[PDB]
Scaffold this active site. Sequence first.
Site, PDB file in Angstrom:
ATOM      1  N   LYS A 228       0.919  -1.237   0.115  1.00  0.00           N
ATOM      2  CA  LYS A 228       0.053   0.088  -0.220  1.00  0.00           C
ATOM      3  C   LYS A 228       0.751   1.173   0.088  1.00  0.00           C
ATOM      4  N   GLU A 314     -19.656  -5.025   8.590  1.00  0.00           N
ATOM      5  CA  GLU A 314     -20.434  -4.171   9.362  1.00  0.00           C
ATOM      6  C   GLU A 314     -21.365  -5.086  10.180  1.00  0.00           C
ATOM      7  N   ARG A 342     -24.911  -1.978   5.254  1.00  0.00           N
ATOM      8  CA  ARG A 342     -24.310  -3.427   5.295  1.00  0.00           C
ATOM      9  C   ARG A 342     -24.772  -4.038   6.439  1.00  0.00           C
TER      10      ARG A 342
END
Lengths: 572, 582
Positions: A228, A314, A342
């Site tokens: 990343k 979630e 979600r």
Amino acid sequence: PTPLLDTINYPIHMKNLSVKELKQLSDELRSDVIFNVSKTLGSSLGVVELTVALHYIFNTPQDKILWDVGHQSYPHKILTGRRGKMPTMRQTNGLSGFTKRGESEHDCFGTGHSSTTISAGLGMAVGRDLKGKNNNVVAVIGDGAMTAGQAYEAMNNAGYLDSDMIVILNDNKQVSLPTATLDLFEELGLYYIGPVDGHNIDDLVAILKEVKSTRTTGPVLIHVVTEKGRGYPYAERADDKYHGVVKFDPATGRQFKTTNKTQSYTTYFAEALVAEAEVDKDVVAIHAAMGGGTGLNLFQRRFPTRCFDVGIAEQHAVTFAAGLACEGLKPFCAIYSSFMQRAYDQVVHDVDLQKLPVRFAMDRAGLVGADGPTHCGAFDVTFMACLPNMIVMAPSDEADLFNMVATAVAIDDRPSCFRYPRGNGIGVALPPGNKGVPIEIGKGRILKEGERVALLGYGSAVQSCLGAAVMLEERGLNVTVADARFCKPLDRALIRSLAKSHEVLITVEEGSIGGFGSHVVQFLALDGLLDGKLKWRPMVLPDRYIDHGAPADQLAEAGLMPSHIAATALNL
Amino acid sequence: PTPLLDTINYPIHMKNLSVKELKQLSDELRSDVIFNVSKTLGSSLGVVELTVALHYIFNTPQDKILWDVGHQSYPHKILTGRRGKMPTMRQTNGLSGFTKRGESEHDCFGTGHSSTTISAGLGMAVGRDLKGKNNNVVAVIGDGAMTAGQAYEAMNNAGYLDSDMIVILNDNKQVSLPTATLDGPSPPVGALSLFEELGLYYIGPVDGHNIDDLVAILKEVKSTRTTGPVLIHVVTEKGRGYPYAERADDKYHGVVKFDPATGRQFKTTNKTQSYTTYFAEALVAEAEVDKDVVAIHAAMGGGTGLNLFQRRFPTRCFDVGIAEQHAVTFAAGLACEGLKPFCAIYSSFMQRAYDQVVHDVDLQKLPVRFAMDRAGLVGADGPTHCGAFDVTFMACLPNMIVMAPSDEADLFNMVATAVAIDDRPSCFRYPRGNGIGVALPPGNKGVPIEIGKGRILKEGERVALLGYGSAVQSCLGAAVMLEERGLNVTVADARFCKPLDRALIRSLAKSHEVLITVEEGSIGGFGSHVVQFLALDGLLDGKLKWRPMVLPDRYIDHGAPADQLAEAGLMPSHIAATALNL
């Protein structure tokens, strides 16, 4: 600087490169991504090589490359003729900060919310196969997005249906949430290839060439391994930061410290919560993937024994809070309103049915602006508010947020939602809240006098209402503004009292026109106060998804901003 | 032979009856089932031994035995003092047909939706650990529940947190878990059940019916000496120890009335023409003439009626397993590729896919049709399964058209429009229940309808009863007398909740002294839309006397839909009482 990319307006142009040039092209793409993000990175940078390899290999938009979340697809866009629109990426009227099917043929899916790529790609793969078509499907899902349930079940099914599709697991070893600017498998019966160097572009090209057409045997997960922030040393070194870096100097890594330059509702919730858990051992915070962006970094540090990153799950966060709450904890699901969708069912079913002590601290409530329609959390005031025993709040400030936190932790009645926007607490000119004293749940607070017209609204919307009514402050407060800081229950009594005494109301919410406005109208209907004498003006998010902008832009166009409330007030 | 298990009253008593006594207990259970039938199955039978073992080993309610979906937990309930309440299970005012925390201390979770047990038991495990407690947590999850994302992610996290907790992976045959509102779920590909990457202890597969072995396994894993999360794949014939159920776990999922002695059952209930059958028939009819049509269901193929659809259009049928999220985003992906995917799913389970509808479908206005079965009150599957929320949650989703057909014809018309209307998604919400079987396309149940445009079904200008589906049947039934009374009170098939027939609402609103809305949904749905539209049509004085007559904002315990609807005050009698209040 970018001679390859200068000659790349699309994946065909990239294919006119040699594989050897792809390493060069990726450096260019990363430098472009760096520059694109330098204005105010890590996911896209970490994905460049595989994007490049995928667009080198695959024949988008014929082939389908789906980007889970789409936050990492900056090179994908760049390489699909949106390079020069990266400058206005996520900007109002610009491109999305994600792949957006309406934006590009190369955007196979309209992502923002994560973990969809697998299911979407499965959908595409099936849908191709059904139509007897024969183009590739590729998804690129992050390791973070892989943690989601919808990812895993989608893979379960992808690998049950055994279709042509190339999942790519983009493992930079980062749970990275959905947002548009600022963010093995043995039993799946899927081919698995990797982990691999997700930055050996030529190798990814080679793999991708050799996997995408295996497809007669069914899908492949190509586990790549990225860094990343790859090719931006600072982002590599501090991906968490750099992933949604502010305006930075590409020369130095140095960025504008927005976080510290402000104080967010994340910070306030975090501060309130890290404060609360000190005194409350039943308090447990749970984030889906968002220790950072719900502000809970300090909470996680202070109460690591009460902090739960579920990854981008979630549903998990909420049902895990249901399980915590079932064991008599006071679990608090920190989550964004967009992502609470979600967990919707998990709220409804896992929490609310048993009226569990799950608190929901709800960031990014209403218009998040930049994160656009995938991330506008305007719907919780609707969807949460239709759930029996989901109390819903919106603090006007950190004081109210704390009070709200402090009530929900203390009120084992049923779950409580606390929705507050992406942004920071503005309470200077506009009346803010109390000081940190638990309020009466459901009981709104008039913040401006008036009996002609009452602006029921909350959080971002009350800031708008109070902002709209600023002049009424200065004019003997003809227009009241009530902190409708409870959406569930409403302050039925205050509503009843204003609505029986006012010629009109304005409801305002940073939510769709099915939320608070509809609740007020519901309650008024139930109070029979919806006579022709009474009026009510719902000034809110329209029932259209809201493309990325400033919230202010979106709210202005939605007509809940002070000016539009004031225009309503002039219509009243 | 009641006696032995009849004198058994507590978990301690059950423990007292151990080896060469388990068989007697099983026989007693069978006898109890027979007794329940005489006056006034499949996973519960399939899960007897695991339940027995879990309660034999674990000191519930101190220890936490969670039951994913909770449907298979009939032995659990039986063995936790609710044996004599099995007679009234799923019955109004009786016990839930699922574990329900508010029903029992032994119900560690309130289930009916699948795949929650892992996350719940993780929450319990954590919550114990956080409280420095030390009781066992166990969940029993089916493989069908395991196919769900929420199961999988929860296991991912369970194995990330490495708390002491137990998952008993149930259902060797991998057969879908018996959903009380779903029916012949056997063509589901839900077989996730392996967990190496979840870092979870994995044990088994073991005989999920070798009780003493289950006990043995359970003792040696679900001791407090065990650290971290363990999966016990047990191997459990659905219907176990009821031959017919073992032979036809699809049917004996949720067998109708039957004779224990003969397996002979009242296929009668299922022999009704359901809304499932209508949707199924409509859709199997539609897909013949539409190759973009692809039906998707989340392990509900039997009770979305799609067994015939899967049979006829296997190349367009997608069981995603218990993965509604998956179904909807997969439909988003189908739809993205220019299909006309139709997520057949129950309104209760559509809530799972809520985001996937919002995000995955509606933001791109994808041609995901939703054929929302079990819409409104499903009745006897209670609050875990009442799909009264779709009319709300969907209706706040831009471009999610929402319908409610009054019959199969309207349902087809609705289907037929949403397939034709592939520029956007459309939800079609119709209840658990029965309607009228219409003719296939030969009789042209492909009536064109204008989406969004209601249909007055009864005249009247005094009061107008805007309602749809079950609620229109209530409005019309309310207006039975109104009909015999010069038609004073109109009834409008408000068969579109999104968009509303703003024009008809407006026209009734401005002409009627009063309205009633009626929906087999929470008082956040249709009624809230109507009033929101009346609000906006304050241009035309939508400030009529309106009566939302609907499901309250209270979760509804298992009953008849009609009982619940009556108590919700949307039934004909209550609408008529409203009409008298008007």
